[PDB]
């Protein structure tokens, strides 16, 4: 099956400039129109352009056509996007699409993202949210506190139960002072599904890093 | 050069409602696609080449259109319909995208369940305490959190995340979280959290007090 698969992104200085690759598999690279799409975040779909089979036609962006450039190899089934002199507004998720006729992106990637920003990078604390027998029950509410990361990134939260009356909620990240984010991911829980002495286990892992896992208590 | 209007730019529809949008021109345009986009997902092939539904899509979809001016139809809303919308017209050697159509889901109007959490031990030992509020499963989405230490307002250091619609429940959920310093914490006894929302007159109020032990 098609795949498409973005990497290059991460921190980025601003003024600085990075390279980005798309990986595709599944389908005779060499043959197909390929595209390159960006999102902002909380932004709609920007068009940066495109590029012909055998790279003798690429199509930009009338205004962007100053700081992209679009190439591929076809050897190695990869698509390119070099990026110059990245500005925070440039700041965004990047996805790689296969076109098919009449200009359709037919399949796309899951995107990197690029951050344009001088701060350093800084993981995540993990905190317990319980409240004590007198304060809640029926149904339980635990959490996991994600606290002062960043660059924002992709955040894959797990919790050690599910069922149909066991409700997940994660938070969207917001963005503190300091410029650190700060997300909570809730479990909502039948009181008979959390009786006292047990826990539930969350499992966060921040992009390609290792697993982070904290047992929350279901009463304080 | 070619610019798309989507209308209505944000919508709502009840369960089983027919539900029409726009996607209009500013010129002929060679083609037009639609795409639906979720909370954390990467856009989905939705509506191609006008009125084709992309291999997954329910029938309830329809595309049409000609010339300058296009639609979308979803013949009975349904609860995890509820996205954004985005159009595409393609005019060799162009490509321009909408700037989508927000579909909610309407719903019944609820009201938000609060709870409030103390710091941890283990943010405290660190230095840091963190009081969080969290608003549960209310509709429609507009809601004004406050924080009051020692029964006065507090504005500063205050986080606010709001979700995205669920879209089984079609419910907003919020979370507020207040930071501040172990020092600062300690200094004070009573923390509350409270809520406006439409379907009250007066505030929803969750506080605790943190003294003696
Ligand atoms: C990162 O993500 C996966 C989630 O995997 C899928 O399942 C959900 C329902 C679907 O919407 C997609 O997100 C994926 O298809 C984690 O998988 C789960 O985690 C635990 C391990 O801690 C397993 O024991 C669960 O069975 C497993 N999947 C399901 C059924 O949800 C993966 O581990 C996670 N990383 C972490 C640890 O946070
Ligand atoms: C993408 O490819 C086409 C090639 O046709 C370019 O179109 C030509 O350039 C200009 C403006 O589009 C026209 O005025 C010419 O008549 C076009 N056609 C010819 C004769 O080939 C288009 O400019 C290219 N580039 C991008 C970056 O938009
Ligand atoms: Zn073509």
């Known amino acids: 099956e098609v795949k498409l698969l973005e990497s290059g992104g991460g921190l980025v200085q601003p003024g600085g400039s990075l390279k980005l690759s798309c990986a595709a598999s599944?389908?005779?690279?060499?043959?197909?129109?390929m595209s390159w799409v960006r999102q902002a975040p909380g932004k709609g779909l920007e068009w940066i352009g495109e590029i012909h089979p055998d790279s003798g036609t690429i199509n930009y962006t009338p205004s962007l056509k100053d700081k992209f450039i679009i190439s591929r190899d076809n050897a190695k089934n990869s698509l390119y996007l070099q990026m110059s002199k990245v500005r925070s507004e440039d700041t965004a998720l990047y996805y790689c699409?296969?076109?098919?006729?009449?200009?359709?992106?037919?399949?796309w990637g899951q995107g990197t993202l690029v951050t344009v920003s001088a701060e350093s990078a800084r993981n995540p604390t993990i905190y317990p949210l319980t409240l004590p027998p007198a304060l809640s029950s029926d149904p339980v509410i635990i959490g996991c506190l994600i606290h002062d990361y960043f660059p924002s990134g992709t955040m894959n939260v797990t919790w050690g139960k599910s069922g149909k009356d066991i409700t997940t909620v994660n938070f969207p990240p917001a963005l503190a002072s300091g410029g650190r984010y700060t997300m909570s991911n809730q479990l909502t829980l039948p009181a008979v599904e959390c009786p006292e002495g047990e826990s539930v286990k969350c499992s966060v892992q921040h992009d390609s890093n290792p697993v982070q896992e904290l047992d929350v208590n279901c009463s304080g | 050069e070619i610019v798309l209007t989507q209308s209505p730019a944000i919508t709502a529809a009840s369960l089983g409602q027919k539900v029409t949008i726009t996607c209009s021109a500013s010129?002929?345009?060679?083609?037009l696609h639609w795409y639906q986009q979720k909370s954390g997902t990467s856009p989905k092939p939705w509506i191609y080449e006008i009125s084709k539904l992309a291999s997954g899509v329910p029938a309830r979809f329809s595309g049409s259109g000609s010339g300058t001016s296009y639609s979308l139809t979803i013949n009975t809303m349904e609860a995890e319909d509820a996205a954004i919308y985005y159009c595409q017209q393609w005019t060799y050697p162009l490509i321009t995208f909408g700037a989508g159509t927000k579909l909610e889901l309407k719903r019944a109007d609820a009201a938000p369940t609060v709870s409030i959490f103390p710091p941890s031990s283990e943010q405290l030992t660190s230095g840091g305490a963190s009081v969080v509020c969290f608003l549960n499963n209310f509709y429609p989405k507009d809601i004004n959190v406050k924080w009051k230490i020692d029964g006065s307002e507090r504005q500063n250091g205050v986080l606010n995340s709001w979700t995205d619609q669920d879209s089984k429940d079609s419910t907003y959920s919020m979370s507020s979280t207040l930071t501040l310093t172990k020092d600062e914490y300690e200094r004070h006894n009573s923390y509350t959290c409270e809520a406006t929302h439409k379907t009250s007159t007066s505030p929803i109020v969750k506080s605790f007090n943190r003294n003696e032990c």
């Open positions: 599944g389908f005779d690279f060499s043959k197909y129109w």
């Open positions: 699409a296969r076109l098919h006729y009449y200009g359709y992106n037919a399949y």
């Open positions: 010129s002929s345009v060679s083609s």
